[PDB]
């Protein structure tokens, strides 16, 4: 079992050496700051090699994604699968944000605020947008560039492109094969930095030991982190996906998770989404009498783009490093988090191994220290096998309310 | 009439309605500075969704631009009318910048600006010119890097990649395919933002009536203008078309108005140069004994690229806008605004539905407060009816001039 | 001869005239400041000039160049030779910083520059890395972002780039020729203002003679300088070539100078190692022994790519700008100049008219004043002659070793 999937082995492996060798360097003396920085600076190197490649990865992605959109994928059941995953994505990095902000682990007006944030999302320049975003000082007002890349705009700016490049049809098809080349060349890099990452890891998460000047105070709030995670995922699951089953459908939710528990514990299991497809497949369209017209294209599309589990999880663990270095985000950083949380949880699947990048890109969108993602990498695989079973029921709900919002039409087309 | 052209029509109804809101609400009592704000900000969010497109727009449209250049379009009759083009639209901003600063509407050493203008041309970084300039300070002298865009280095740069490009030939076709979809996909884009633009325009206009502190005064300055601009045209055309006919020909220039009167009608009619071909073939082709195969070229490129109306207007309006905000132009950017109206002239025509980008284009080459663009906006479609005038005029005169500048060559290709 | 080879002439010339007018002007009286200024202004404009394409021709030459690999280029002759390339140019460069610092012409921690190095090796931002260097202040410590070209942070992800696009084969071959037409377009570039040059360098030398206030002290160091250099390339190739050919074949280096002596002679003749092939061709295969197979590969690759007398000269010659300018290189500067003099040192000879280019890439990578490179021109003549000699040697030598690495193979494939 060693030598299959080795990443996950490696990456726990130095985990628990990291950690080791910082519980065993913290009992020895008070440490020299340069020899900790010394101890550090690896997990420095790979968090500057992934945050090279968020730039042309987004510019890369958005324009080979959107103008890949069939508007023909079979009639209304593209758009109404889209339209399902576009917002129950949005409802589950809403109540992350929320249950983040009120369990609280881990201890200028709000209309500038507000006002800064509408004018980050069109930027006055397109290289400017790419490491400064604009804010708003005080004495008379004024603005000011501080330092940082402007997320919000840059995909803003290239939805308008891939959205405007789509309608071109085949005349822009020299551009969107260029797009796909270095969307490959990307991918295949990102592909080598993560095989780089459980060396820097355990540098990191040594280099967190070491300097955190009392240890049963920050495995308190790693306990409350895991506790609001899992109230987040409870609470959305249970609660929100059959309440919006039931005022869609009208039919009695209780019978269909009867139905899909077989693709439940096998997502618990496997912990992962892409390899439950054929029992999820067999618990839908063999028990709870879903179309094959419908399950063929909803699925498919749902293991890749619908992932609300990850959007909690990314909505929570933003706010919780936020919230571990003293900063409070204000008005125009919490709608930041819940709109790059949204946008990153559809990433975070559709690239592969991509899975740390995405937890970057919130940390640089709204301007937060990146080194305390160590703390998150510790509990990432007691929390990724509860994040698939959210994914896999928001699948199956899915394809559960498509199906009922398309009955007229297939039956129309059967007869 | 309402359905037909619903683009001028909601902006002259988003004018009115916009300053009647404007001059009903500095009545009521002297604004709080935050709620002017809150109604300037929509025409904020215009400023800069054209402003992120001025970057692009010259990019691709240098580009696609100079590699299009036939050497043999017709031999010297290519090359004739393209040197017309290029001084008469000179002749008409440097008219237009010194009657600018001669009526004067709207009440560091020469030699180091000039020497900042000669290093801002050639720029040691590509990337730094798209958003920084250079400028020497002083206290010994030291060089040190100012913000803004630098347009005239890229302008510079482009011309020079586009001229290398098209000496290529055939090699370099992948490169103008992927630059000619790169401009559509920038021309739809400017299409869509100024279907957006009635809603800024007026939120412009009311933020400016609101915050005016004196209604009077400006009413003053925007009769000056529009003096200066009619000034400015009746002197270029009148008298600067027919001693530039006088002094090539050696024909009399009279007998020239009396032949294209029902062109210049028309034009005063339609306020559209570019439907006003079929009037001016017409005239010439069958009044003024002007060979069809000099017009059937000279017209339908001077429609498009030869705007020496729209040169004078556009560099009177920028010093304009530098005299009302009290700014003095030195001499650096006398010569900015100079090339930058010359340069935007030929892009205002050739770009559809892009006339308030080459306001900009000037207004971000000479650094300039951009928000007092509505005061123009307000008086525009009294003046672009005696615009297009100028621009026909001066097409016309073009086919007089290259037709005697070729009688030779034309009779040798007759026997 | 005056009308053959255009350049060259044209160079001594500017520089004799310029020396004429500096040597003449400085003895007329104490020169104003701002006139020695406009004086020295064209070669300001030709710095800015090349300045201005150091980055295009980086990104299209690494693209363009490490995608064109081949694998089996002969099988093991293509990787022995490469590491016969790499290794005698980074000696070579080395010795040359080594005895620049030991001779001495021109009269924070080390830990922080090393790590400061590191972190400039993985930029955080690629738009931020066109433009500015990060450094270490200190008071605590904190990362400041100075300003100035980060060359080596490029270099490194480019090279990722391509070698990442070589492997995907025949699927990325759009952009290949995307690069190879741009990489065509920024040559033809380079070749231009390289016919402007010879102003340039006149007024450049002119302005350095007349603002150099002792005459005798800048005589010595251009004699020390030149010393360096000849004490480096006669260390280098006599010493270190033979030595190298000594330890791999274990035959008597001396009959190897006896046999390639006319090429020597030759390469001194014609200065240039590109047309000395059919002498060396006609040395090596028919007084060495060396087999047809190995030279016809070796010699017409190490004649673009095997330029060590070009590295120690350009790691000499930008440690001498340091030194004349004060300036005391750290740690994190000298492994800078040792392998940016490696990388140019191959581009200088593989970008034909691009002599100038390279210097000032050296010379931006670790941040000095390029106007003290108007000194280093007036004594290249001197130099040129000897440096293509040691790059002649350090080719035969290359085709001696690599046939002795080889000889079993070329049996097998003889039998
Ligand atoms: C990569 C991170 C750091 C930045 C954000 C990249 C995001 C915005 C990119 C990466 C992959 C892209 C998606 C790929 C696939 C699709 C399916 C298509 O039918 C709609 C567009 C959509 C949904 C794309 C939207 C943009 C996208 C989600
Ligand atoms: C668009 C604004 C913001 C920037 C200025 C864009 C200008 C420089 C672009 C837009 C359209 C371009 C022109 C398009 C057509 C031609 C005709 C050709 O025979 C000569 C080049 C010329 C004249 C191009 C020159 C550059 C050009 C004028
Ligand atoms: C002028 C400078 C700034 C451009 C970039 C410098 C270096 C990195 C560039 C310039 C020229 C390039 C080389 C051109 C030719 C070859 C031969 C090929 O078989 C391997 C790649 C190689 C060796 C390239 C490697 C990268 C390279 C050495
Ligand atoms: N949930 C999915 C897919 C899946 O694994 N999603 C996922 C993947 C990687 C991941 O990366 C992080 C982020 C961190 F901040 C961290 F500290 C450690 C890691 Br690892 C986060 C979420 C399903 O199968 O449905
Ligand atoms: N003159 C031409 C073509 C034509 O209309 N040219 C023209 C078009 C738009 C324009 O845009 C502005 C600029 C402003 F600053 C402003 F405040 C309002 C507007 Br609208 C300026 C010039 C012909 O037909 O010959
Ligand atoms: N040595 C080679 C090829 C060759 O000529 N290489 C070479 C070419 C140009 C050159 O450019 C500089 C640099 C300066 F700093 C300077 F001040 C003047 C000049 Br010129 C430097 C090295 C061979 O033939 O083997």
Redesign the interface.
């Known amino acids: 079992k060693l030598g299959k999937n080795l990443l996950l082995t490696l990456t726990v492996f130095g985990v628990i050496l990291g950690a080791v060798c910082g519980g065993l360097l913290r009992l020895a003396s008070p440490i020299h700051?340069?020899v900790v920085?010394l101890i550090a600076?690896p997990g420095?190197?790979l968090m500057?090699?992934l945050?090279?490649l968020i730039?042309?990865l987004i510019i890369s992605s958005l324009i080979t994604g959107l103008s890949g959109l069939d508007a023909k994928a079979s009639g209304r059941l593209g758009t109404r699968a889209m339209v399902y995953y576009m917002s129950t994505t949005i409802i589950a990095a809403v109540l992350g944000v929320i249950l983040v902000l009120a369990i609280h682990p881990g201890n200028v007006s709000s209309?500038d605020a507000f006002?800064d944030l509408?004018?980050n999302l069109?930027?006055?320049?397109?290289?400017?947008a790419?490491?400064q975003q604009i804010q708003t000082v005080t004495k008379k007002k004024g603005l000011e560039?501080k330092?940082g890349?402007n997320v919000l705009g840059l995909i803003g700016?290239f939805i308008?492109?891939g959205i405007?490049?789509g309608?071109?049809g085949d005349?822009?098809k020299?551009?969107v094969?260029?797009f796909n080349?270095?969307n490959?060349?990307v991918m295949?890099?990102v592909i080598?930095i993560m095989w780089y990452s459980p060396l820097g890891i355990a540098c990191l998460i040594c280099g967190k030991i070491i300097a955190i000047k009392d240890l049963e105070v920050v495995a308190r709030q790693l306990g409350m982190y895991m506790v609001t995670v899992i109230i987040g995922l409870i609470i959305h699951g249970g609660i929100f996906l059959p309440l919006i089953y039931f005022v869609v459908t009208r039919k009695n939710p209780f019978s269909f998770f009867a139905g899909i528990f077989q693709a439940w514990i096998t997502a618990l299991g496997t912990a992962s989404s892409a390899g439950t497809l054929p029992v999820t497949f067999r618990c839908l369209e063999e028990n709870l009498g879903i179309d094959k017209r419908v399950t063929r294209f909803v699925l498919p599309v749902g293991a890749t783009i619908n992932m609300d589990g990850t959007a909690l999880y990314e909505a929570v663990a933003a706010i919780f490093i936020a919230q571990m270095n003293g900063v409070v985000l204000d008005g125009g950083q919490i709608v930041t988090v819940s709109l790059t949380a949204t946008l990153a949880s559809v990433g975070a699947a559709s690239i592969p191994s991509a899975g740390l990048v995405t937890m970057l890109l919130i940390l640089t969108a709204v301007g937060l220290p990146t080194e305390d993602i160590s703390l998150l990498v510790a509990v990432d695989w007691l929390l990724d096998r509860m994040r698939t079973s959210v994914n896999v029921v928001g699948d199956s709900f899915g394809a559960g309310i498509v199906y009922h919002l398309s009955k007229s039409e297939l039956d129309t087309i059967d007869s």
Request: hydrophobic share 60%; charged share 25%.
């Open positions: 700051p340069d920085m600076f420095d190197i500057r090699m945050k090279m730039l042309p209309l006002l509408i004018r069109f930027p006055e320049n397109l290289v400017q790419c490491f560039f330092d890349m700016f308008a492109f405007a490049m309608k071109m005349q822009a020299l551009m094969d260029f080349i270095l490959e060349i295949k890099l080598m």
